[PDB]
Amino acid sequence: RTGSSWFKIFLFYLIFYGCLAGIFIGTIQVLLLTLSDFEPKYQDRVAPPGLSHAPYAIKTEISFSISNPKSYESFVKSMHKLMDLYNESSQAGNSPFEDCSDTPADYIKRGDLDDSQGQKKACRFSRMWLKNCGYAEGKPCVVAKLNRIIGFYPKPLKNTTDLPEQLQANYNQYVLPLRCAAREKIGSIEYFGLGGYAGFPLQYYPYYGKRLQKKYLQPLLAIQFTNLTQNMELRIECKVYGENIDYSEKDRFRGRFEVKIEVKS
Amino acid sequence: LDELKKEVSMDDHKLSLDELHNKYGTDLTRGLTNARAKEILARDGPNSLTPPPTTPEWIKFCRQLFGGFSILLWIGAILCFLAYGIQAATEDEPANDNLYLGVVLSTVVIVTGCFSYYQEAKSSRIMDSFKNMVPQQALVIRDGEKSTINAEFVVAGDLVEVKGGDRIPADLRIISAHGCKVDNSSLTGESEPQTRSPEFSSENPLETRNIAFFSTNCVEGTARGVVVYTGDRTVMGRIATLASGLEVGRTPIAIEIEHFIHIITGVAVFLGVSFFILSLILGYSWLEAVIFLIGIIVANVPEGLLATVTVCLTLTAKRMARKNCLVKNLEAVETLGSTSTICSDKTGTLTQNRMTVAHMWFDNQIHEADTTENQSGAAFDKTSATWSALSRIAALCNRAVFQAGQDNVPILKRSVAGDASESALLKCIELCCGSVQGMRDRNPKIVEIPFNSTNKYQLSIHENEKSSESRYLLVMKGAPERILDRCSTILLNGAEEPLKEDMKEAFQNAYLELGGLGERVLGFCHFALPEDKYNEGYPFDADEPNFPTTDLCFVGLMAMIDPPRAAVPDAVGKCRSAGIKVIMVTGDHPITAKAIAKGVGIISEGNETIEDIAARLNIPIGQVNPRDAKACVVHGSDLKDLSTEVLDDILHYHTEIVFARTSPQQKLIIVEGCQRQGAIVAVTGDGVNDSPALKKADIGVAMGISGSDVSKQAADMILLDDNFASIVTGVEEGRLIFDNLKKSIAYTLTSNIPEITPFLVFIIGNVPLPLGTVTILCIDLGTDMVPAISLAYEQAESDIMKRQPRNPKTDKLVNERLISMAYGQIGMIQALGGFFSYFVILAENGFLPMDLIGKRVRWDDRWISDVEDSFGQQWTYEQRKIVEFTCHTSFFISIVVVQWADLIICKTRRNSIFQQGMKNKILIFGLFEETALAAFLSYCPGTDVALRMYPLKPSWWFCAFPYSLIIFLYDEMRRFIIRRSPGGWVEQETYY
Amino acid sequence: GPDNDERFTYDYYRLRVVGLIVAAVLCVIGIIILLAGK
Ligand SMILES: C[C@@H]1O[C@@H](O[C@H]2C[C@@H](O)[C@]3(CO)[C@H]4[C@H](O)C[C@]5(C)[C@@H](C6=CC(=O)OC6)CC[C@]5(O)[C@@H]4CC[C@]3(O)C2)[C@H](O)[C@H](O)[C@H]1O
Ligand SMILES: CC(C)CCC[C@@H](C)[C@H]1CC[C@H]2[C@@H]3CC=C4C[C@@H](O)CC[C@]4(C)[C@H]3CC[C@]12C
Ligand SMILES: [K+]
Ligand SMILES: [K+]
Ligand SMILES: [K+]
Ligand SMILES: [Mg+2]
């Protein structure tokens, strides 16, 4: 508390906090310089991919009434918010999109992570490939996807030893297998994929990242539970497999879901 | 209440013995009846002191449990339970998150309770020390026969008998006494025995010879007296109540802290609410804007600050114990440094309490002996043949003896059997002439006339060691005028000589000068007896002068005094340079008081009392202008008649004050008078008559060895070695730590800012939370601790004894200059250092700063497990969270890195780190151990769940570095300014 | 090539090892300095 001296305070901070914002910004802007536009410096924190899905699960749960239409207007929203993305109206011209193997094929290298070439071209994906999926008002349809990682080639396990879905139409070479499970077998699993299989096609990898590939489209795998059980909380775990895929006791989303469906009506 | 006790006593030594019995329904010769004794008991109550209203054990601990931050921390704990309550009910989130969070906060106080229950303890056993002085039994006469009784059963009226060795059981009127001497040190602080006779001798009850006081002890003789006062109603019974029942009060340091808690609260609630209204303007309800206000507690409340101040206080006290200086209270560590006036008792405090030979007069010359403990002075004379003739009388005409078994202990410290003056002579000769026993053997005593009351002299006759004689020597000593009235000759430099009126005056000079030094004077003379009239086996008559007692050879004078302790004069000098006022306050007589006053420097050369002037000028004192007198010397008998306002003025108007012949209540008044002015006062004393004063001082210091137990109980500090120079040290410590505490407040508070800003910008910028609750506690109860504590080993940045005492009203421990420095400036550079590491971690994991704005809602959205980063990648909940907690971890570490700087710059308030150097090893220890703790919390496995602390990549460690160095430079720059321009700007804005 | 898997690994174990080692050393050094006299 002074007088005719406050001007000696205000003016001080004006060009001291000035000098300091100026230095702080000074150091952000140097740091920023030393990073790729195309690729982060570290990726060991997305290290194995997580598996995420379209139905916005309140708390990993989808309890809803069949005898009510708006008892599930919510989930349908996120479904369409996601699905509106896979429009064939959107994917227009030979640029920047590409028609790819209607059947799961191999990886597609598109050069380096440079801008020496324009936008790296992106494979197409018809939402029609998700036959069957308002969605399932009963016995719901759930859409799965693999979290994008720049330069990540997902590698399906090679058939050598025992494998859960034992060699059943196993596309060993070019598909990343997704199986859903819960003992307690009161469901009816069905899988709408690309070429018909229940996995992700290797022909979408590696992801090249937004700055080099905006409007890129990652695959999907519809999962319909036209089960023969009703009006109870059912705990099902969809999970992906592969060499590059691991799971965690804490990250309950690390390469897998956990859904609490309840078609209560 | 206690004001009545501050008045002096009123009595009945003037009554006749008969009148006294009359007044107490008692018989002088038979004493009370067993019947009337018992009756008079239930009437008045026991001969016993009534214990003071103590303060219980429970309430002592519980009053600390709301010690500022304490209460505020309950508000957090309780409101973090507003979280676990709404959660574990509606939305059961299974965790120890906000439960265990809430818990820590409160039990942070409970265990901390022992630190302020360590800071404000009280050793209050005054009354129990007083109670010890009442004997267990008394000898009364009832129904004409004497019997011993429980001393409590003693009542006003009955006949009591006391003899050498025992304690005065109650206040008595002497009706009969035979050769009775008494020790009244409990009242006067003077121990030399005093006669008791039945005849009243002074209108003053504390001075008359026919009253013997409780809390004193009959030293020799036999006496009988009538009990006039019992239990609480005795002179010293009142002193006990007064001393015991005083209101202790708040110390300076305590008041400095309380004042800091107000400033602290003051900004905790200004920002606390300021981020309720700002949160509201941004779209937050009374469910969100409220949770943040209470939110902004921890960040503002230093949880580690109490503990720090305490360990600092404690660590300083430990050093002073290592200098033979015991402190009973933690708060008492500082007070000596804020002390403006010291009220010192004289005897056994400033002085050694030990009649020592000070000067001699012989060879027509004044000499000065060494009076110090360790005899630090020099040799005065040994050559003179006179000296030895004198020495001879001093050793021979002397009946004192060194108590058995002390060859181990030094002369001046060893206990002697005998009166003070004779012990003085004994210790003098033993010291500078070898064994006195040696002399008393070589010259056997054949007869002597012990010092009479009437003769006013003591002589002996001795066989002379000299074989060529082996004839008879006469030696005598006594009143210097009386020894000259019995002299014909004078041993000058070996040979006798007529006592010319010329010398009869050089003596008379010496006698008056030494007498003026406030010293006790003795005359000495001898006579080599004429062998003719005195055979080898000649008989002498000590009953009737069978020998000459007139016309003897005068040899010399010796003068003695209870002299100052060695370092006292200098100790006084040092305090006065520190701008501290030293006032003597003594129960002793004024001549003696004043003499020592001059001797220890309380009164300086040239200074004068009105009486000095009037004597010099040969005018009346009514005609002296009082303001010409800077010194004064006030007798207790005069002090008694003065109003408190009149004392205040005496206090205002003098620089060199001596209150002499003061009672215990009067020492208290002076102190109260001194405090009334505003001063912080240290009482230093050693007797039961200092108790009320010690107990009233802001800090009471007592003498360890000589100190009575009562003084010791009443004090806050004990000088275990009776080394008064310790006082100087104490003030110097109290000054040092006051400063070094500021430094530790500054250091601790600075990290407040980098801990707060993150949560704010979290709300204001909608970015992910940069630092977490848990992370902050590791800084406050972990990494900042040893650094904070270690600042107490900082030194002086100048000669702090060279500066005046602080004005306690104006010079606060925590001022605005410190908040603007810790908050406005340094803490601000610290926040950016932290925020930088933040942006680095996220930016390097794919979240550039620009995209961070507005995200927290997605980011903290637990249901999104595919948050898209800046590069296009997708993140689960736990994934991104692991990154955030890594940020929490590197932010934590950023602080440490910049607390490095804050530590080195808080090391000094004025000096360059290049001037002060880095000799503080505890501080350096702080840096290493602090960093070791952080590395631990980061890299130790398990601490990623027990504390959500993640490992840091080596590069992470250096983010803050440019910010740590900028702090060093900024501050080193700024104090370089300070020094160059002492007068004005940077100093008046930022100098602590 | 298609076998770039080091791009998603970090040796946190060795970090945690070297971190603790350094912590222990700094810890010790601190003592050595403090106990320069007691
Ligand atoms: C906007 C807000 O953000 C999320 O919660 C935020 C507010 C609140 O909930 C808490 C926990 O209670 C706060 C708490 O309150 C205040 C703090 C004690 C605060 C301090 C101030 C201080 O002085 O020391 C420390 C800084 C962080 C703090 O340690 C926690 C951190 C976790 C958080 O969770 C964060 C939720 O998503 C919430 O639902 C949403 O409303
Ligand atoms: C998160 C951001 C907005 C924090 C910035 C807070 C700033 C504006 C605050 C915090 C600490 C404050 C300073 C600290 C204390 C003092 C000393 C006082 O006698 C006058 C004001 C002054 C000089 C303050 C001015 C404003 C100040 C600098
Ligand atoms: K804090
Ligand atoms: K006191
Ligand atoms: K702090
Ligand atoms: Mg004394």
At a glance:
The complex is a heterotrimer of chains A (265), B (992) and C (38). Chain A has 265 residues and is α+β, with helices and mostly antiparallel strands.
Task: Count up the domains of chain B.
Answer: 4
How many β-strands of chain B, per DSSP? Answer: 27
Q: Biggest interface: chains and residue counts?
A: A-B, 43 and 34 residues
- For the report, how would you describe the main beta sheet of chain C? none
What kind of oligomer do you see? Answer: heterotrimer
Task: Provide the CATH architecture of the largest domain in chain B.
Answer: Up-down Bundle
| CATH topology annotation of the largest domain in chain B | Calcium-transporting ATPase, transmembrane domain
Q: What small-molecule ligands were found?
A: ouabain, cholesterol, potassium ion, magnesium ion
Number of domain units of chain C: 1
> Under the CATH scheme, which class of the largest domain in chain B?
Mainly Alpha
How many E strands of chain C? Answer: 0
What is the alpha-carbon Rg of chain B in Å? 38 Å
Q: Helix amount of chain C, in percent? A: 55-70%
Helix content of chain B: 40-55%
Dominant shape of chain C:
rod-shaped
Rounded Rg of chain C: 18 Å
Spatial strand sequence of the major β-sheet of chain B: 8-25-24-23-9-20-22-21
CATH superfamily of the largest domain in chain B: Calcium-transporting ATPase, transmembrane domain
Alpha plus pi helix count of chain B: 38
PDB class: hydrolase/transport protein
Keywords: membrane protein, atpase, K+ binding, ouabain binding, haloacid dehydrogenease superfamily, phosphate analogue, ATP-binding, hydrolase, ion transport, nucleotide-binding, phosphoprotein, hydrolase-transport protein complex, Membrane, Transmembrane
Assembly: trimeric
Entry title: Crystal structure of the sodium-potassium pump with bound potassium and ouabain
